[PDB]
Amino acid sequence: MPHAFKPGDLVFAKMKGYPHWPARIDDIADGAVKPPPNKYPIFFFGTHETAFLGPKDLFPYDKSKDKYGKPNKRKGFNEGLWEIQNNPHASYS
């Protein structure tokens, strides 16, 4: 059975106006800005941007990849597909 989201989990994350996007739940570094309550820090592969999202916008990657893991015209998207499949836990700083 599912647990709650934890750092390191791989997802497609949904933002208004954008396709479901390859992403991971990030850790929060010591001294770094924390997310609002009930939100997680989401790192978006390809763009390398961070937003704060709740579970309603987070789709586990294994279950969802057949639907959402297809190339997209959007900037950074196909780079993001490579990252989530080939090195999802690397440092992209």
Swiss-Prot record:
It is found in: Nucleus; Cytoplasm. Residues 7-64 form the PWWP domain. Widely expressed. High expression is found in heart, skeletal muscle, ovary and testis. Overexpression is frequently observed in hepatocellular carcinoma samples. Interacts with HDGF. Interacts with trimethylated 'Lys-36' of histone H3 (H3K36me3). Interacts with trimethylated 'Lys-79' of histone H3 (H3K79me3), but has higher affinity for H3K36me3. Interacts with IWS1. Interacts with H2AX, POGZ, RBBP8 and CBX1. Interacts with histones H3K9me3, H3K27me3 and H3K36me2. Interacts with DPF3a (isoform 2 of DPF3/BAF45C). Interacts with SMARCA4/BRG1/BAF190A, SMARCC1/BAF155 and SMARCD1/BAF60A in a DPF3a-dependent manner. Belongs to the HDGF family. Acts as an epigenetic regulator of myogenesis in cooperation with DPF3a (isoform 2 of DPF3/BAF45C). Associates with the BAF complex via its interaction with DPF3a and HDGFL2-DPF3a activate myogenic genes by increasing chromatin accessibility through recruitment of SMARCA4/BRG1/BAF190A (ATPase subunit of the BAF complex) to myogenic gene promoters. Promotes the repair of DNA double-strand breaks (DSBs) through the homologous recombination pathway by facilitating the recruitment of the DNA endonuclease RBBP8 to the DSBs. This is Hepatoma-derived growth factor-related protein 2. The chain holds residues 1 to 93 of 671 of the full protein.
